[PDB]
Design an enzyme around this catalytic site. Structure first.
Site, PDB file in Angstrom:
ATOM      1  CE1 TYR A  30      -2.906  -3.244   1.114  1.00  0.00           C
ATOM      2  CE2 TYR A  30      -4.437  -1.437   0.956  1.00  0.00           C
ATOM      3  CZ  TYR A  30      -4.186  -2.789   0.971  1.00  0.00           C
ATOM      4  OH  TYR A  30      -5.221  -3.667   0.873  1.00  0.00           O
ATOM      5  CE  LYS A  72       5.882 -18.388   0.500  1.00  0.00           C
ATOM      6  NZ  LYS A  72       4.895 -19.512   0.372  1.00  0.00           N
ATOM      7  CG  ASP A 107       2.070 -20.990   2.003  1.00  0.00           C
ATOM      8  OD1 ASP A 107       2.638 -20.800   3.113  1.00  0.00           O
ATOM      9  OD2 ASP A 107       2.616 -21.652   1.090  1.00  0.00           O
ATOM     10  CG  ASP A 125      -7.162  -6.209   2.421  1.00  0.00           C
ATOM     11  OD1 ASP A 125      -8.132  -5.566   2.945  1.00  0.00           O
ATOM     12  OD2 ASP A 125      -7.221  -6.701   1.278  1.00  0.00           O
ATOM     13  CG  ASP A 157     -12.038  -9.308   3.807  1.00  0.00           C
ATOM     14  OD1 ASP A 157     -11.943  -8.294   4.540  1.00  0.00           O
ATOM     15  OD2 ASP A 157     -12.624  -9.339   2.706  1.00  0.00           O
TER      16      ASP A 157
HETATM   17  C1  IPM Z   1       8.343 -23.566  -0.262  1.00  0.00           C
HETATM   18  C2  IPM Z   1       7.774 -22.332  -0.987  1.00  0.00           C
HETATM   19  C3  IPM Z   1       8.952 -21.506  -1.612  1.00  0.00           C
HETATM   20  C4  IPM Z   1       6.736 -22.767  -2.069  1.00  0.00           C
HETATM   21  C5  IPM Z   1       6.138 -21.457  -2.677  1.00  0.00           C
HETATM   22  O1  IPM Z   1       6.067 -20.469  -1.913  1.00  0.00           O
HETATM   23  O2  IPM Z   1       5.733 -21.444  -3.868  1.00  0.00           O
HETATM   24  C6  IPM Z   1       5.628 -23.622  -1.413  1.00  0.00           C
HETATM   25  O3  IPM Z   1       5.070 -22.816  -0.299  1.00  0.00           O
HETATM   26  C7  IPM Z   1       4.538 -23.959  -2.449  1.00  0.00           C
HETATM   27  O4  IPM Z   1       3.403 -23.408  -2.380  1.00  0.00           O
HETATM   28  O5  IPM Z   1       4.903 -24.579  -3.451  1.00  0.00           O
HETATM   29  C1  IPM Z   2     -11.367  -0.817  -0.055  1.00  0.00           C
HETATM   30  C2  IPM Z   2      -9.919  -1.285   0.181  1.00  0.00           C
HETATM   31  C3  IPM Z   2      -8.925  -0.219  -0.398  1.00  0.00           C
HETATM   32  C4  IPM Z   2      -9.671  -1.539   1.702  1.00  0.00           C
HETATM   33  C5  IPM Z   2      -8.220  -2.106   1.837  1.00  0.00           C
HETATM   34  O1  IPM Z   2      -7.796  -2.785   0.877  1.00  0.00           O
HETATM   35  O2  IPM Z   2      -7.556  -1.893   2.885  1.00  0.00           O
HETATM   36  C6  IPM Z   2     -10.707  -2.553   2.237  1.00  0.00           C
HETATM   37  O3  IPM Z   2     -10.608  -3.759   1.377  1.00  0.00           O
HETATM   38  C7  IPM Z   2     -10.399  -2.897   3.707  1.00  0.00           C
HETATM   39  O4  IPM Z   2      -9.934  -4.032   4.010  1.00  0.00           O
HETATM   40  O5  IPM Z   2     -10.396  -1.955   4.505  1.00  0.00           O
HETATM   41 MN    MN Z   3       2.744 -22.537  -0.656  1.00  0.00          MN
HETATM   42 MN    MN Z   4     -10.105  -5.625   2.747  1.00  0.00          MN
END
Ligand code: IPM
Ligand code: IPM
Ligand code: MN
Ligand code: MN
Lengths: 329, 329
Positions: free
Chosen positions: B118, B163, B194, B218, B222
């Site tokens: 951002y 990450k 992830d 963000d 959610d």
């Molecule tokens: C180990 C990591 C670098 C790899 C990625 O981030 O792509 C794994 O998390 C996956 O999703 O394959």
């Molecule tokens: C509308 C968007 C710019 C905002 C953000 O991404 O922060 C909203 O998704 C939130 O989470 O407050």
């Molecule tokens: Mn992964």
């Molecule tokens: Mn949001």
């Protein structure tokens, strides 16, 4: 014969790859297997997670089969094996298919696999660190085209997930996906990355071919495994213009390393996607897995008392009973 | 009297803010409310989503109460009102608290709110678009400190989600969060972005004070609303060194605009966090909400047949029966 490089890696990697190769050895004898080491051990010998000369073989093999690799956070200098291979073999498309293995239903994710926040431009200077999220016309186009072919092949659509309200590169990426999908008559639905997590857990199966930037795809694809029983059933293909690599989405899980309980289904089904890519019969492996699942006992990560070997023996079982007849029947 | 700027915005923003202000007017008379317009209408008059002179008032008010704002994707030149305010008022900490409103349990997220992806550095040139994910020592430190105070206040710990295996800036960010939390005796658990999505849906309540980069926050926040019934119960505070803004996490939902069914609880509870920030009594609003929830009918997004007004009248109800006695009792 087809030539396939195999990289078991470490932790449970060797275990689940033993399983996936045996299953492959049971549906076809048209594939020769060449084994290579890779990961920290090789780094410590050579300063790389893969040997230069081995990499030279691997890039000339017809396809690659990869297990998992431990990447210790506290080992300076070390590049992840899988990121290295992704980059070295030009593998720009990561396709992750998360199955509910009762119903036929799938979550289908196309994760862009060469750029985004993985492109590799990063630095720290004077208490300011950056990483550069790069989207290129060529990167956008070719993952867009890859995604339309998965849509068409399924008579489906694309859900493009992004944050184009905040990210210039996602605005750009969006133009290009809409352009290629239009040019080819495929519907593209927008989804925003934050609200799409909600849609993805509440409403899993209505999203078509999901497409997103590299790191977004990384995140969504792990999240989507809440709908399969475990991350351990889920396979992937990493595809480039002249080769592909197949690996289970799960990691090297050194906790359960050598305990004989690891779930081989992710690797096995990744073997399926490899047969497809070679023009051999992945469907057999898939059907063999659906059949074994109906009554077969599963591994602890899915909730059963079954060992790795029982799952492997069981699926080979179902395969044998499929090769017992002709393609017809 | 305390001076509070109010920005209903559009769509359902005015509706849920009417509710939150009435609830505030029922627990205290020590707050004066000043209303300002903002969003596309103001852009089209003035070329900005907020007027310069209004912004001057707002930055001198004691706190800000903000509803929601429609940000149309297809309107060129337009900066999101909320991003503008975040930046203009130096609001670097976004605190989102997702409640299960039967149990007492909470998911507590500290989203860094000034930098990351951002920060605003982005460009397209010759089919190459970038966005720059910036982490600064000062940005890291102050969101780290904010997070340790939420940990301490709860006798808890920090889960730092990142990450850092791929992102240089997350490596940097991590050092600094560990340094400040150590310096202050707070535990920091690692989580990877992830796999943490999986932990966050399967195991919601064991993560302490979650902390992450702006866009990661963000996304996680959610996602965490799958555990409350709806994104519409969830409040936030955006805090800076001399002012704060409070808004429900939900958006402007123009679908249900004016239908009288919008859930005001997110705004109401965001009003609670505003009373806390002023040194007044948010606990009253919180308790009033827990009490009304036990038997009260909810809005459709949560599954009930109740109108917005029934929820608002009902909570005021419970509040009146709390101000009927002294602080003691
Ligand atoms: C180990 C990591 C670098 C790899 C990625 O981030 O792509 C794994 O998390 C996956 O999703 O394959
Ligand atoms: C509308 C968007 C710019 C905002 C953000 O991404 O922060 C909203 O998704 C939130 O989470 O407050
Ligand atoms: Mn992964
Ligand atoms: Mn949001």
């Amino acid at each position: 014969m087809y030539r396939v490089a195999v990289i078991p890696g470490d932790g449970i990697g060797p275990e689940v790859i033993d399983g996936a190769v045996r299953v492959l050895k049971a549906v076809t004898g048209r594939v020769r297997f060449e084994y290579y080491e890779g990961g920290v051990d090789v780094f410590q010998e050579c300063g790389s997670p893969i040997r230069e000369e081995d990499l030279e073989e691997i890039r000339r093999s017809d396809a690659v089969l990869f297990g998992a690799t431990t990447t210790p956070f506290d080992l300076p200098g070390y590049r992840s094996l899988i990121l290295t291979l992704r980059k070295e073999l030009g593998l720009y498309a990561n396709l992750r298919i998360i199955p509910d293995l009762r119903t036929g239903r799938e979550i289908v994710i196309v994760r862009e696999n060469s750029e985004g926040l993985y492109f590799g431009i990063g630095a720290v200077v004077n208490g300011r660190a950056v990483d550069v999220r790069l989207i290129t016309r060529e990167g956008a186009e070719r993952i867009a085209r890859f995604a339309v072919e998965q849509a068409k092949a399924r008579g489906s659509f694309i859900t493009f997930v992004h944050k184009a309200n905040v990210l210039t590169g996602d605005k750009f990426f969006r133009r290009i996906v809409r352009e290629v999908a239009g040019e080819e008559g495929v519907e593209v639905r927008d989804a925003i990355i934050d609200s799409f997590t909600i849609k993805l857990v509440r409403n899993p199966w209505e999203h078509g071919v999901i497409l997103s930037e590299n790191l977004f795809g990384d995140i969504l694809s792990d999240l989507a495994t809440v709908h399969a029983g475990s991350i351990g059933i889920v396979p992937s293909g990493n595809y480039g213009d002249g080769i592909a690599l197949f690996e289970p989405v799960h990691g090297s899980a050194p906790d359960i390393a050598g305990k004989g309980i690891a779930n081989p289904i992710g690797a096995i089904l990744s073997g399926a996607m490899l047969l497809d890519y070679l023009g051999l019969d992945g469907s057999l492996i898939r059907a063999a897995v659906r059949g074994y699942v109906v009554n077969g006992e599963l591994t602890p990560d899915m909730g059963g008392r079954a060992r790795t070997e029982d799952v492997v023996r069981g699926i080979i079982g179902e395969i044998e009973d499929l090769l017992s007849m002709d393609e017809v029947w």
